[model samples]
Target: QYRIIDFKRDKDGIPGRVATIEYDPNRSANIALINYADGEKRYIIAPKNLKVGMEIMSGPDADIKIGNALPLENIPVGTLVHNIELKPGRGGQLVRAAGTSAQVLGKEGKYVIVRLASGEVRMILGKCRATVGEV
Candidate 1:
């Protein structure tokens, strides 16, 4: 139930196959394993609609879809998101938990605005990465 996931850290552009999705959903946000090679593994908070062996992608240019981590500008308005980074390169620090989600509100330029799970709205940098789905 503690926050440990970071989207804008080293996870960007690092491809990994989902070896397994585990943990108690009722007790936590759920967990999954991603491995690049033998023993090159890391655990991540599994987002909604994720799957075993589903396409793995991360970075600013990645598609805006379920579990495909992308920057807020490319995600389009009205998309539900989680694991948001408050500042660029700061990693995810907001709206992360079981069943918690944030809505991308507005984006006209480099600044992205989002409405959080608490109904609090604020502007975030477009480059601050976040997952494109509910937590």
Candidate 2:
């Protein structure tokens, strides 16, 4: 359950929105019905402990809440995050498996280094938004 506001855009020029959380058995985790301010609707993976009616946001100014989305550079070091985007505005592409999470190892240059549960270290663009908790 979430609500989004401010309709901010990523590097891809797509505006972010607040989504309503819902459950879909076909997916490993909960899902969100993103209600974009422009009347666009998208379904996305929700983080753990997320409930319906909550408002989630995606952008640099997004809050550091469990379901809120923010760029890797905006997240603090050592924070656990999930639903990570591989490229800016590409949506979440990593650590979205049920009960899985990735740790923000450090930030270098314009990239945020993450340590996957698989023990692989990946460097992603700083602008990629990631949910704050495990999925």
Candidate 2 CA-lDDT value = 0.71
Q: Whose lDDT is greatest here?
A: 1
Task: Name model 2 segments beyond 4 Å from true.
Answer: 1-21, 34-41, 97-99
TM-score of 1: 0.83
Give the TM-score of each candidate. Answer: 0.83, 0.72
Candidate with the greatest TM-score versus the true structure:
1
In model 1, which regions exceed 4 Å deviation? 1-9, 24-27, 37-39
lDDT of 1: 0.74
Cα-based RMSD of the predictions, in order? 2.9, 5.3
TM-score of candidate 2 on Cα atoms, chains taken together: 0.72
lDDT of 1 by residue, 1-135 (tens): 543444553566666777677875554667677775434676677787788886556787677767777877778889999888888777788865455788998996778999988888989989888888778
